[PDB]
Design an enzyme around this catalytic site. Structure first.
Site, short mmCIF file in Angstrom:
data_model
loop_
_atom_site.label_atom_id
_atom_site.label_comp_id
_atom_site.label_asym_id
_atom_site.label_seq_id
_atom_site.Cartn_x
_atom_site.Cartn_y
_atom_site.Cartn_z
CG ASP A 166 -1.97 -1.02 1.62
OD1 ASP A 166 -2.25 -1.34 0.44
OD2 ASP A 166 -2.86 -1.08 1.75
CE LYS A 212 -11.24 -5.60 -0.83
NZ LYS A 212 -11.52 -4.18 0.54
N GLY A 213 -6.22 -9.94 1.06
CA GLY A 213 -6.36 -11.29 1.26
C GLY A 213 -5.47 -11.84 2.93
CD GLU A 223 -8.03 -6.63 -2.98
OE1 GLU A 223 -6.82 -7.54 -1.99
OE2 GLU A 223 -8.21 -5.52 -3.06
CG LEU A 228 -25.50 -4.29 8.84
CD1 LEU A 228 -26.55 -4.25 9.63
CD2 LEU A 228 -25.88 -3.43 7.02
CG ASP A 238 -8.40 4.66 8.52
OD1 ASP A 238 -10.12 4.62 8.02
OD2 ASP A 238 -7.37 4.30 8.10
CB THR A 285 -9.19 1.46 6.14
OG1 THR A 285 -9.01 2.45 5.66
CG2 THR A 285 -8.21 1.10 5.21
CB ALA A 286 -8.19 -2.97 7.17
CB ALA A 287 -13.21 -2.18 10.02
N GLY A 288 -13.52 -4.54 8.50
CA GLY A 288 -14.54 -5.89 7.97
C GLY A 288 -13.35 -7.27 7.22
CG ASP A 289 -9.70 -6.84 4.77
OD1 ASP A 289 -10.65 -7.81 4.80
OD2 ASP A 289 -9.15 -5.82 4.25
#
Lengths: 297, 299
Positions: A13, A40-41, A136, A214, A239, A241-245
């Site tokens: 990144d 993501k992985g 991805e 959600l 932030d 970012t990456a919460a879902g990961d």
């Protein structure tokens, strides 16, 4: 404990800090350039490693370049094994971030595009019990893995574009966020009514469980036997970012330790909630002790 | 024999990300392609000198310790280009987003180029050179100090034109602005822009010995105390004018090094530039000496 493999993407990144979003025709100096391991992985693998504390098997294609070395160093410290080096540049995310902290991203698949069926060590993969997938890498690889995996298959439809309908019947968990479930519903069912109905329609295609992430509103788990809403923790987010990961990796860690899906959802909700309180992607991944202190607290 | 040329300046990796449309704020977009090219004005000129001069090139430049610096060292080594300095910052890079129409925008990370300070200049070694090429892609203080101290021919390409201090001009033997640059420079230093010829003349008043204005299609203008000679360029089918000015400057300098008079050197550089604009790319467009000679013979 059940053994987890992630099959997916790794990125460097590349964060370019700028005053304002660069306009067409404009040349602008970057205030800073900083690079961080990503994808993501990898984010999911790193979550599994950090929260599970038993490393992670992570099948991923990286390059032979400096950024690749950087990722390997990261993986090695965390007990993450399974990376494959190829002669393409490591997958890259070019992330332009303005002074307000808004960003945009150009993604170059690079090595990620080489992660094809032919490179999967299927025998070694059969040693795993839980499989984490995203979108991805070439979809045909992700599809083949979901098809072939004897074990729990978790598919994060992220990004939602380029997904074929054939995968759904092979999934134990489908984990869209709100934007994804909307896109997915439109795509496959020709409409988007609600989150609940879209989740129901995926169960019809053979998906065993839909977990809809959600954000503030928490998570929805939908299967044959229930439609459980789980509220999340009130944190001060900085932030997302990456919460879902983080959710997915921690969810998978919980299942690996024999927690039921509802317990696992609570556990990953905790982990994700901690992560949104930190700047960045992998830098926001909490340690197991942090997740526990959260739930105890 | 020949005069020895040093370039003191910039090395950049140009990272071209081909996209469908300009990425919007909040958007994640896949690059259609990523292609990386060597760049920077300094390097483009050094590579020109080496390839057209065929005697390599002394090129004081700051690069990093990364994979890109390794690639630049390979390029430099193969062409007999020496003098680079490695530092711990990333090699300078430019991130160029190009949409399907070919319109682009650019984020520039100076990186290692910003470390090329006056304290890093090997002045004893630099005094072994007779011709000096400068641009404006390293800290100006370094550029300025070089132009001040150089006993030899000092050629300054005011590119980009911003951040230049007036003090440099009196030390110049050649100032080589393009048309947009001479405009900006005239506005900044003389409070107006009338014409290209009038601006060039004013630079002569600050002590610049020769102004060479690169005019693209319109050719080049040489202005000094003794003459205001316009040189038409060679009618070629242009495809890509990238690095044309860099090619001009390096080839111009090669000519001087070989004892050509400035008018001859302008012609020679004009020919080299003209061949370059017929080829895609920056350093990839630089002709070989034999190509430049075949061009000139062919007239």
């Amino acid at each position: 404990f059940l053994v987890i493999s992630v099959v997916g993407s790794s990125n460097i990144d590349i964060v370019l800090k700028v005053d304002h979003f660069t306009k067409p025709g404009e040349t602008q100096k970057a205030i800073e350039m900083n690079v961080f391991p990503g994808g993501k992985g990898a984010n999911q693998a790193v979550t599994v490693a950090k929260i599970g504390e038993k490393g992670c098997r992570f099948v991923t294609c990286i390059g032979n370049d400096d950024y690749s070395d950087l990722l390997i160093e990261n993986y090695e410290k965390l007990g993450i094994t399974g990376y494959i080096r190829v002669s393409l540049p490591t997958g890259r995310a070019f992330i332009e971030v303005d002074k307000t902290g808004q960003n945009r991203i150009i993604i170059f698949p690079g090595a990620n595009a080489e992660l094809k069926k032919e490179l999967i060590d299927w025998n070694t993969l059969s040693e795993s019990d839980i499989l984490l997938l995203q979108n991805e890498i070439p979809f045909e690889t992700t599809l083949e893995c979901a098809k072939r995996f004897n074990g729990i298959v978790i598919f994060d439809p992220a990004p939602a574009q380029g997904i074929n309908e054939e995968i759904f019947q092979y999934l134990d968990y489908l984990t869209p966020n709100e934007k994804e479930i909307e896109a997915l519903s439109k795509d496959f069912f020709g409409e988007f009514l609600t989150v609940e109905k879209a989740a129901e329609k995926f169960l019809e295609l053979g998906v065993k469980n839909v977990i809809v992430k959600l954000g503030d509103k928490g998570v929805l788990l939908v299967n044959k036997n229930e439609k459980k809403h789980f509220p999340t923790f009130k944190v001060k987010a900085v932030d997302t970012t990456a919460a879902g990961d983080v959710f997915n990796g921690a969810f998978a860690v919980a299942l690996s330790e024999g927690k039921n899906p509802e317990e696992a959802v609570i556990f990953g909700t905790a982990a994700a909630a901690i992560s949104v309180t930190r700047l960045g992607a992998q830098s926001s991944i909490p340690a197991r002790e942090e997740v526990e202190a959260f739930l105890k607290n």
